[PDB]
Amino acid sequence: GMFLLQGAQMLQMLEKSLRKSLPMSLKVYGTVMHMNHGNPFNLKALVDKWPDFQTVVIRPQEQDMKDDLDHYTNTYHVYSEDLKNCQEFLDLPEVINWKQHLQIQSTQSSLNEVIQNLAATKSFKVKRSKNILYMASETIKELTPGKPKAIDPEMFKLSSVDPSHAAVVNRFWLFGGNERSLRFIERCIQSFPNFCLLGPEGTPVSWSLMDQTGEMRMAGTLPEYRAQGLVTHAIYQQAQCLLKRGFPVYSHVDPKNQIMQKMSQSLNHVPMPSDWNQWNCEPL
Numbered sequence: 001g002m003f004l005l006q007g008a009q010m011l012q013m014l015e016k017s018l019r020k021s022l023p024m025s026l027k028v029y030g031t032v033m034h035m036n037h038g039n040p041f042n043l044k045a046l047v048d049k050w051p052d053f054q055t056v057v058i059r060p061q062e063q064d065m066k067d068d069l070d071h072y073t074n075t076y077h078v079y080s081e082d083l084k085n086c087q088e089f090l091d092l093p094e095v096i097n098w099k100q101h102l103q104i105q106s107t108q109s110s111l112n113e114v115i116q117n118l119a120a121t122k123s124f125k126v127k128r129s130k131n132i133l134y135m136a137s138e139t140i141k142e143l144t145p146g147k148p149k150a151i152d153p154e155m156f157k158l159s160s161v162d163p164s165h166a167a168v169v170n171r172f173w174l175f176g177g178n179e180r181s182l183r184f185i186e187r188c189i190q191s192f193p194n195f196c197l198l199g200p201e202g203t204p205v206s207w208s209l210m211d212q213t214g215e216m217r218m219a220g221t222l223p224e225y226r227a228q229g230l231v232t233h234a235i236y237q238q239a240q241c242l243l244k245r246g247f248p249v250y251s252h253v254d255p256k257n258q259i260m261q262k263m264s265q266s267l268n269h270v271p272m273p274s275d276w277n278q279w280n281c282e283p284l
Contacts, residue, residue, distance in 0.1 A: 002092055005045040011036050014045055014056065018079065022143045023135060023250075023274045027107040028079040030214030030248055031058045040191035041212040046095055054085040057095050065100065071280060072184035074102040077213060078111055087114045091121065098122040104279040105213065107133055107272075115279045124281045131276040132261070134269040136239055136249035143248060146268035148232045156197045156230065158237055161204050163189050165196075169207055172220040185209065185218065193245075195237040197230050206230035208238035216242075216251040219260075232263050239267065252276035 005011055015036055018029040035043055035058070042061050047053035058077035065074050076096055080086030090096050096104075104115060112128065119126050137146070161169060166189050170182040188194070192210035199205035205225040209218040216238050219231050239249045251269065253260045264271075 001049055002089070002094060003047050003050045005047065005050070008036065010050070011045060013051060014047070014053075017051070017053070018056070019143065021079065021081075023133065023272045024108045025079040026133070026135070026248065026250055026274065027105050027213055027215075027276075028056055028058060028077045030250065031077045031212060033247060034192070034212055034214055041187065043212065046089075048085055048089045054082040055080040055089040057089065059095070062097075065097070067180070068100040070180050071101040071103050071282075072180055074100045075212075076102065076104050078104055078106045079108055080111065080114070083110060083114055086111065087117055090114065090118055098124050098281065099283055101280075101282040104277075104281065106277050107274045109275045109277055111277070112279075115281070119281070123284045125284055127280045129278045129280070131252035131254055133272040133274050133276040134251045134253060134264045135272055136243065137268040137270055138243050139248045139250065140270055146236075146266070148236045148267075149229050151197075151228070151230070151233065155200050156205070156233070157202075158233070159196055159198050159204070161189050161194050161196045161207050161209070165204050168204060168222070169209065169218055169220060172222075173218050176218075188212075188217065193238065193241055195234045195241070197233050199225060206234045208234035210238065210242075214242075214247050214250070216249065219251075229263070232266065235263070236267055239269075 015032045018025040042064055043058050046057045048055045056079050115126055163186055166186045170176045170185045188209050188211050194209045196204035196207040206221040208216055211217045219235055221231050242249045253264060
């Protein structure tokens with residue numbers, strides 16, 4: 001079937017049900033937690049059956065998805081208990097619009113075969129980004145049962161990124177650098193907590209953001225400030241505020257990037273048995 005969840009009662013039930021499938025449901029779980037805190041990205045939760053769903057999809061509003069090329073906006077979050085059920089659900093045109101450039105995100109790598117099967121029936125091609133999934137030790141103990149190196153406090157001050165400095169984050173985001181990606185960063189900075197270290201001139205020199213899934217995202221440093229462990233400070237603070245607000249602390253790292261794996265380990269972030277995945281889909 002296909003059901004659109006409506007109202008806090010249903011969205012809170014969905015959040016609680018997904019808690020039982022962490023960490024593989026984490027990408028969806030974090031997204032639903034933010035829908036339950038004002039739904040700033042105007043998303044909707046779809047399931048194949050209620051209350052005992054097999055497949056959940058979080059998707060944006062059709063009339064916000066006016067630009068077929070805006071894969072940052074055209075993002076879907078998926079978790080499924082039954083791969084055949086998932087393929088039948090994602091085949092429904094009200095669930096996913098495969099005619100656009102889009103992103104599917106999940107911490108469930110087994111969805112790869114569902115997406116490859118639908119690429120063959122829905123006339124799209126796929127490029128998969130697979131990264132290591134980290135979670136804070138503290139989040140692991142609560143949901144699925146560590147400090148930075150000292151820097152000079154006269155040199156660096158903790159703050160948050162002003163929306164007027166989105167451009168710097170976007171400038172150094174290696175999956176961004178363009179206008180559509182800037183607009184996505186601006187929505188993340190407007191909607192969700194973020195931390196930066198200000199340099200001696202009072203502008204952001206390192207930063208940690210969050211997106212609509214609750215994941216820590218888009219960490220970076222000004223080139224002149226690299227190799228000083230400054231991003232560790234921004235991510236540590238971001239993580240501390242998430243813990244305090246009762247949200248999961250999670251992130252991902254490219255297997256190539258040993259500096260960010262080491263930094264993750266230094267903050268007691270643990271690599272998980274689930275992977276981080278983004279399937280970039282566009283029509284043939």
